[PDB]
Structure 1
Amino acid sequence: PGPDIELVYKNRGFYKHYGIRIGDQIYHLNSQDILTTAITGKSEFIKEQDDGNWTHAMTAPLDYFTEKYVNSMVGSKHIFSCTTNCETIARDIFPGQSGISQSKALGIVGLILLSASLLSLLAV
C-alpha cells in the first residue's frame, strides 16, 4: 500500500519550509527558523487548511523520502510533538500501515520535513 505523497513548500528567507499535503490539509512544523529549530532539537506539528499559497516540490511514495532521511547515516536528536488536530496524521500519511503509532508517524514525517528544509539550502 501507500499512494504517492505530495511534498510542498513555502519560501522562508533563503530556504524552503516544507509540508505534506493530503487533500486540503497541510502537515508541517510550527518552526519559524530552520537553524534555530535544529539547534533547539524539538518541534510541534500543525495541520492547517491549505491557504492556496503552497508550491509543489515533489510527488513520490513515502519510501522515496524515508530511505534518504530516516536511516543510519542521518543522526538526529530531534523530538516531535503535535496538536490534537494532528492525530489524523497516521491515517493520512500511512494509510497502508494500520499499526503505526503516532510518535513514529511524527518522527518519520518530521525528519523528512526538517531534512528537506535543510537541503533546500543547496537549491537555486
Structure 2
Amino acid sequence: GQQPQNRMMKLAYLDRGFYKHYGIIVGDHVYQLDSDDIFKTALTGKAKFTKTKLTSDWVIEEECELDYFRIKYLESAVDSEHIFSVDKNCETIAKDIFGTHTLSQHQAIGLVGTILLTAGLMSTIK
C-alpha cells in the first residue's frame, strides 16, 4: 500500500443575509454547524456538526492541505450527532489548548466548531 495524498480542504460560506454561514469543504461535501441562525447558536451556547452536499452557492474563502487521516474526525462529528458547548471558555483553554497532549476527537471538533462560530459572528459586523 501507499501514503494517501492530503486533500485540499476549503473554508467557504453561504451568504444568509444577516450572516455568512461557514463550512469546511472536503470533496463534494461541506461540514458545518447544524444551525440556520448564528444568533441561536451563540445564545444557546451549543452546536452540532452536519454535512451537506456541495452546491454553487458556497463561496470559497481559503484553501489548505488536510491530512487524509483527519477527514474522519469531521465524518465522526456528523455521524455521532454529538453536541458540544461553545461557551465553556475555561476548560477549553486550561484542559484542551494548554493540556499539551494530542487533542481528542471531541476536543478537536469543539475547537473547529468554535472557529466556524467565530467566523459567522464576525460576518455579522456590518
Alpha-carbon separation, structure 2, partners of 1:55 and 1:86: 25
Residue 110 of structure 2 is matched in structure 1 by 107
**Structure 2 gap segments, 5+ residues each:** 1-5, 67-75, 83-101
Instruction: Name which of 54, 62, 65 aligns with 1:58.
Output: 62
Alpha-carbon separation, structure 2, partners of 1:100 and 1:86: 19
Alpha-carbon separation, structure 1, partners of 2:28 and 2:108: 19
Q: Kindly tell me: are residues 22 and 83 of structure 1, through their superposed partners in 2, closer, same or farther at Cα, counting changes over 3 Å? A: closer
Alpha-carbon separation, structure 2, partners of 1:83 and 1:14: 25
1:40 aligns with 2:35: no
Aligned residues of 1:6 and 1:60 also touching (Cα < 8 A)? yes
**Structure 1 gap segments, 5+ residues each:** 63-80, 88-98
Residue deviations 1:31-58, cap 9 Å, x none? 1211111010111100222133211112
Helix, strand or coil: the match of 1:83?
A: helix
1:23 aligns with 2:27: yes
Helix, strand or coil: the match of 1:121?
A: coil
Aligned residues of 1:4 and 1:59 also touching (Cα < 8 A)? yes
Instruction: Name which of 118, 121, 125 aligns with 1:118.
Output: 121
The equivalences for 1:51-90 within 5 A come to: 51-60=55-64, 82-84=77-79
Root mean square deviation, CA, Å = 2.9
TM-score relative to the length of structure 1? 0.61
Q: Which amino acid aligns with 1:12?
A: R
Q: Kindly tell me: are residues 59 and 30 of structure 1, through their superposed partners in 2, closer, same or farther at Cα, counting changes over 3 Å? A: same
Residue 11 of structure 1 is matched in structure 2 by 15
TM-score relative to the length of structure 2? 0.61
Alpha-carbon separation, structure 1, partners of 2:22 and 2:29: 13
